[PDB]
Structure formats: C-alpha cells, structure tokens
Design a binder for this molecule. Structure first.
Ligand SMILES: Nc1nc2c(ncn2[C@@H]2O[C@H](COP(=O)(O)OP(=O)(O)O)[C@@H](O)[C@H]2O)c(=O)[nH]1
Ligand SMILES: [Mn+2]
Ligand SMILES: [Mn+2]
Ligand SMILES: [Mn+2]
Length: 601
C-alpha cells in the first residue's frame, strides 16, 4: 500500500485500474512521494514557484505569468533514432523494406524492450515525486476524446501538460471504469544523482528511449525531459498510439491543423492541412488574411482527430488544449496572432531573454530599445550562433488565441470539407493543385516530399506512424467504401517555389488567403479549374492577385515534363523500396496513371 506516500489526492479516490497502474509503477520506480494532480490553478502556480526557487525555470518579468526553461543541450528535441514501437511482428509496425533500412518507423521486439525497460526503470524515481496526471485528449465529454494517465517525475511535464491537455480531477471523475492510455515517463535521474546535472535539467541521453506498445495501450518513455519525448500526449498518444486506435475503430489521427474559413455571405468551411515540421502549419492555422471580407478562425495547429459521423460528414476535433509552437521565425509580420497568444500564461523553452524580462529569437522582427541586451538560450550574453535554440518552443493555451474558432471545443467536432497537403519544394511543384479523386488524393499525400536534401514525408507523418504505412494508406482508401461519406476535396500546396536566383516566387504568409479562397470556390463547385497531368490548377486569372504587384505566375505554375518525369520515377522507387508488398493496388494504379499522363504531355 503506497497510500502512506500520497501527498495530494488519495489512491482510494482513483478508479481501480488507475490505482493498479500507479501502485504497480510506484513499486517499480520507487518514488519518494505520489502527487495526484487536480488540475487547479493553485497546484499549477505553486509548482511553477517551486521550480522557480529550485532554478528550473525563470519568471519573465515583462509578461503576465510567463516562464522560461533552458535545457541541457543534449536534451533539445525528439530523437527518432531512439523512438520505437513494439509489436509481436515487425511487419505490423513497418513495411519490410527491400533495401533493409526503413524510413517509415522503428520496431523493437517485445523481448528486446523488456530488457531495455529493466535496465532503466527500476528505482528510477528514488528521491523524487511521482506525479499522476489524468488528462483528456479532446474536449471533455466529446465522443471523439480519449483519456490517458501520465506518471512522471518531472514538474516541467506537469505544468506543460496542464497547458497542452485537459488535466485534473474532472478528467478522473469522467473516466470511471472506462479505458485509458497508460503513459509512464521518467527523466531517468534517481537521487542521489550519479552524474552532474547540467543547466538544472534532469535528462539521461545515453539511455533515452521513447517506446510505444499499442497492444498494451501503453507509452513508456525514459531519459528525456523535452517536448515530444516527455509530454506524452503531444505525439506519442496523439499520433502514434491514436493512429493505431484509429485504424481499429474507423477514424483518422493526423498531423494536421484545422481552420475555419468564412466567405462574405456568411458561409463557413473547415479545412485540415498536413504539412511537415517547419513548413507552416501554425502560420496558416492562425493566418491573418490579406483579402478583404475573409475570416480565418483556428481550431488546431498540429493534431487532428477525424471521424465520419452518421450523416457522412468528416468531423474533426483538436485533441490538444494548447499550442506547442516553434518559436524562432515567429514575428509581428509572419504570425501576429501567435504573438498575441503567447504574451501571457506561457512556458517558453530554450529561447533568449531580453534585459527587460522579455523573450527573443531569430526572426522575431522586433527592434529592442537602445540599451536592451540579450541573454541566449545557453545562458550567455549574446550579440548579433543563434540567440534561441532552432527547436525552441512556446507552450501556450489555445483558449487565448485571438481567433480561436467558437466550435474549437465543440464535442461533435467541426465538419471538414477540404484536406491540404504540402511542403517545401524549391523547384517543379506549382503553388496549388487539386486531386482528381479520393484515390488520387491519397496518392498525393503518400508522395509528399519536402526540403540540402529533399526527403519523403508522406502525409507529414513519417516520424509518427503507429503502424505499417501500407496499411495506413489502405485505411485512408477504405474511407471511400463507406456509404454517406462526404469525401473532402484534396489539394496540394507549395509556398516555397523559388526562381533561378533563389527568391521565393510567392510572398506567402497572409497572402495564402488567395489560395484558400480558390479552394473554397472549388469545394463550392465553381468552374475555376484547368486540368493538368498532376491535377487541377487555377484557371487564367482565377486566383485573386490584386495588391500583389506582378507575381511571375508563369513560373509559379509551370509544370515541366522533365521535372515530373524525374518526380514520378523517384516516387515509384521510394514506394517500391519502402512499402513493397504493403502498397495498396489503388496507390500503385494512381502512380501508373500519373506516369502515363506525364508521358503524354
Ligand atoms: N516563405 C514562406 N515561409 C513560411 C510561410 N509560412 C510559414 N513559413 C516559415 O516556415 C517556418 C515554420 O513555420 P511554422 O508555422 O512554425 O511551421 P510548423 O512548424 O509546420 O507549424 C517559419 O520560419 C515561417 O516563417 C509562407 O507562407 N511562406
Ligand atoms: Mn534550466
Ligand atoms: Mn507548429
Ligand atoms: Mn478502393
């Protein structure tokens, strides 16, 4: 009975399966104390203050309740090399690649994982508090939401989980005897410390291992205190575990923003968009449009859970409660309404701080006053190496977004009418095109490539598939064999085409409102499209380009046979090597069709 060690809550208060999970791991990890989180502002403020006194975070004097954490530099980002999925058979997790090295995931046997686990977790929380974090991915009471319990020895994880998920006692009461995902996390630094603690940031990079066990409904993560390694809702649950749950249960879990868009006659539409990291999801989800009369409202900027309802609409919820955005590059110009979002109640990690107690990063586009001096993310004075680590983050509540859609917490989700794919392509790929069918659109997602190297990132999910990517494609195709399904139109965009001198052909940012209106009108059925080998593109003058000056539209939409011949050959060899026997017939057929259309142009 670990009851004697409970310093907040009680083990008798917990659903019985939750108690077994806490007590079983308390016996293994041997924490000094067990703190069952209630989600209250009191608990949150007191924990931040404790971390402040211990030197784990600093208060940002300038802002209302904002905080800065600087990590050990060895613990600065997700490590795909150390991120694994455990299943009986490797092929259920990744297609067996012809070449022998899969780019589509990382499998570990159950035997190898048991060994790794036993080498890590016994005694790992000695001298530390085990925090029990009950949380909901999605609005409380939503039929699309799912519940997890995270055990962690990191107060930084507790505070960040309060922002990024719905957390606390209300979640426990709603859970009852229902099912939940078991999330176990340890920074891997029992006390007394065996190694020196760097930057007062507990970390264990040599034993870092982020493991997913879909068949046991468990995520087990060790040795990292950072971001997606430790906030186990952020990706481990939201994409890897959930995409397997989604396959079994008939829905989709995707690396997509969700935004609502309204035309000047009051008609709203919701779009989802899958871009890879650093290709502009957050910017587009919080866009300030440049075109009069248009309104963009943010539902989510990173994760979408989507399920066809009984009437055939694709209903999407944002299962997150906040935004864990990349800070560098965020500015007045590029994302003014992210700037509004983060100036209160926000945790920053690995960005710089100004003399006046503010935040600073590359691309912030903010002249400071003469005299204002800057301290780097490595806690050293800095003069124009970057000031902020490139993967530095803000962690902010979504409720604060000045354009948060009124339905962003609606338990039924919002109806998705268009899905957008895209990434960074400096050559060959036009600004926008539309897929010819659902099957072709799935192929477009599967073929996605993104930027001195161009790499495949199908569906923007390369690091996050919870199971075999060929079966994932089959799952997407199966949505069409579902009577009533109102299959959304699929588009592919490229903000990043360059001319021969390396300059961006498209100014982008809020000017992407001009591409979104075109998509709006195609969903409406407007005849604004010209058929091409890769799909539909906007007709002559269909795109509203007034105010933009003389955009060089010839090259921005130029489709070159020689380029697309190379593209389709590259895609064929990629899918053959990496997907092989698990490539669905329909995707191979779309590939043959594209190759044939290209050969005839
Ligand atoms: N050229 C151009 N750059 C963009 C655009 N949108 C975003 N970016 C840049 O892409 C980088 C990453 O953007 P972010 O929204 O954090 O992408 P995310 O990490 O995929 O959500 C930022 O430095 C932006 O300045 C655009 O429309 N055009
Ligand atoms: Mn620190
Ligand atoms: Mn983002
Ligand atoms: Mn089919």
């Amino acid at each position: 009975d670990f009851s004697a060690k409970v310093i907040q809550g009680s083990l008798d208060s917990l659903p019985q399966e939750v108690r077994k999970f806490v007590e079983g791991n308390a016996q293994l990890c041997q924490p000094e104390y067990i703190h069952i989180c209630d989600g209250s502002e009191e608990e949150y403020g007191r924990l931040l203050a404790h971390m402040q006194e211990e030197g784990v975070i600093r208060k940002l004097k300038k802002y209302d309740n904002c905080w800065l954490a600087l990590t050990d530099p060895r613990d600065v980002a997700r490590i795909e090399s150390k991120t694994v999925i455990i299943t009986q058979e490797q092929r259920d997790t990744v297609p067996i690649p012809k070449s022998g090295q899969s780019q589509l995931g990382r499998w570990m046997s159950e035997e190898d994982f048991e060994k790794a686990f036993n080498a890590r977790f016994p005694g790992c929380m000695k001298g530390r508090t085990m925090y029990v974090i009950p949380f909901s991915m999605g609005p409380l009471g939503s039929p699309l939401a799912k519940i997890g319990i995270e055990l962690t020895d990191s107060p930084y994880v507790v505070a960040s989980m309060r922002i990024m998920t719905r957390m606390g006692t209300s979640v426990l009461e709603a859970l009852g005897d229902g099912e939940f995902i078991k999330c176990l996390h340890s920074v891997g630094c029992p006390l007394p410390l065996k190694k020196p603690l760097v930057n007062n940031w507990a970390c264990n990079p040599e034993l870092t291992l982020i493991a997913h066990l879909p068949d046991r409904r468990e995520i087990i993560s060790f040795g990292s205190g950072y971001g997606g390694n430790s906030l186990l809702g952020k990706k481990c649950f939201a994409l890897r575990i959930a995409s397997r749950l989604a396959k079994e249960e008939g829905w989709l879990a995707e690396h997509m923003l969700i935004l609502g868009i309204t035309n000047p006659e009051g008609k709203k539409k919701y779009l989802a968009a899958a871009f890879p990291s650093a290709c502009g999801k957050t910017n587009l989800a919080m866009m300030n449009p440049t075109l009069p009369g248009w309104k963009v409202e943010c539902v989510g900027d990173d994760i979408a859970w989507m399920k066809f309802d009984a009437q055939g609409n694709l209903r999407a919820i944002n299962p997150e409660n906040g935004f864990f955005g990349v800070a560098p590059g965020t500015s007045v110009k590029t994302n003014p309404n992210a700037i509004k979002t983060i100036q209160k109640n926000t945790i920053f990690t690995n960005v710089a701080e100004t003399s006046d107690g503010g935040v600073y990063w590359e691309g912030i586009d903010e002249p400071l006053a003469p005299g204002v001096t800057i301290t780097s993310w490595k806690n050293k004075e800095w003069r124009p190496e970057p000031c902020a680590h490139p993967n530095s983050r803000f962690c902010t509540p979504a409720s604060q977004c000045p354009i948060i859609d009124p339905a962003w917490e609606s338990p039924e989700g919002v109806p998705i009418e268009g899905i957008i794919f895209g990434g960074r392509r400096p050559a060959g790929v036009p600004l926008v095109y539309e897929a010819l069918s659902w099957q072709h659109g799935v192929f477009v997602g599967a073929a996605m490539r993104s930027e001195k190297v161009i790499m495949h990132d199908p569906f923007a999910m390369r690091p996050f598939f919870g199971y075999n990517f060929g079966k994932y494609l089959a799952h997407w195709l199966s949505m069409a064999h579902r009577p009533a399904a109102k299959l959304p139109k699929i588009f592919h965009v490229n903000w990043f085409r360059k001319d021969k001198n390396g300059k961006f052909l498209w100014p982008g940012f809020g000017e992407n409102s001009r591409v979104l209106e075109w998509m709006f009108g195609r969903i409406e059925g407007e005849d604004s499209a010209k058929l091409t080998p890769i799909g539909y593109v906007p007709k002559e003058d269909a795109l509203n380009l007034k105010g933009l000056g003389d955009v060089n539209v010839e090259e921005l939409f130029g489709i070159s046979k020689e380029f697309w011949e190379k593209e389709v050959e590259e895609i064929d060899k990629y899918l053959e090597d990496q997907v092989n026997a698990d490539l669905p017939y329909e995707i191979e057929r779309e590939l043959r069709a594209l190759k044939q259309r290209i050969s005839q142009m």
